[PDB]
From a paper:
Transthyretin (TTR)3 is a 55-kDa protein that aggregates into amyloid fibrils under pathological conditions. In its native tetrameric conformation, TTR transports retinol-binding protein and thyroxine (T4) in the blood and cerebrospinal fluid. Amyloid aggregation of TTR occurs by dissociation of tetrameric TTR into monomers; these partially unfold into amyloidogenic intermediates and self-associate into soluble oligomers and amyloid aggregates. Here we identify two segments of TTR that drive protein aggregation by self-association and formation of steric zipper spines of amyloid fibrils.
Next, we performed structural analysis of the isolated strand H segment to test whether it forms a steric zipper structure. We found that 119TAVVTN124 forms a Class-2 steric zipper (Ref. 25 and Fig. 3D) in which the β-strands stack into parallel β-sheets with one sheet face packing against another sheet back. The side chain organization explains why the residue replacements E92P and V94P hinder TTR aggregation because the proline substitution would decrease the shape complementarity between sheets in the steric zipper structure. Moreover, the crystal structure of 119TAVVTN124 is a Class-2 steric zipper, face-to-back arrangement with parallel β-strands and parallel sheets (Ref. 25 and Fig. 3D). The side chain organization in this peptide also explains why the residue replacements T119W, T119Y, V121W, and V121Y impede TTR aggregation. Taken together, these experiments suggest that the 119TAVVTN124 segment is important for fibril formation. For additional evidence, we synthesized and analyzed 6-residue peptides containing the same substitutions, and they did not form aggregates or fibrils in isolation. First, peptides with Tyr/Trp substitutions did not form fibrils in isolation.
Numbering used by the authors:
A (entry chain A), B (entry chain A), C (entry chain A), D (entry chain A): 1 to 6
The structure:
Amino acid sequence: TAVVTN
Amino acid sequence: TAVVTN
Amino acid sequence: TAVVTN
Amino acid sequence: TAVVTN
C-alpha cells in the first residue's frame, strides 16, 4: 500500500 | 494498492 | 489497484 | 484495476 499526496 | 494525488 | 489524480 | 483522472 502506497498513498501519496504531492 | 497505489493511490496518488499530484 | 492503482488510483491517480493529476 | 487502474483509475486515472488527469
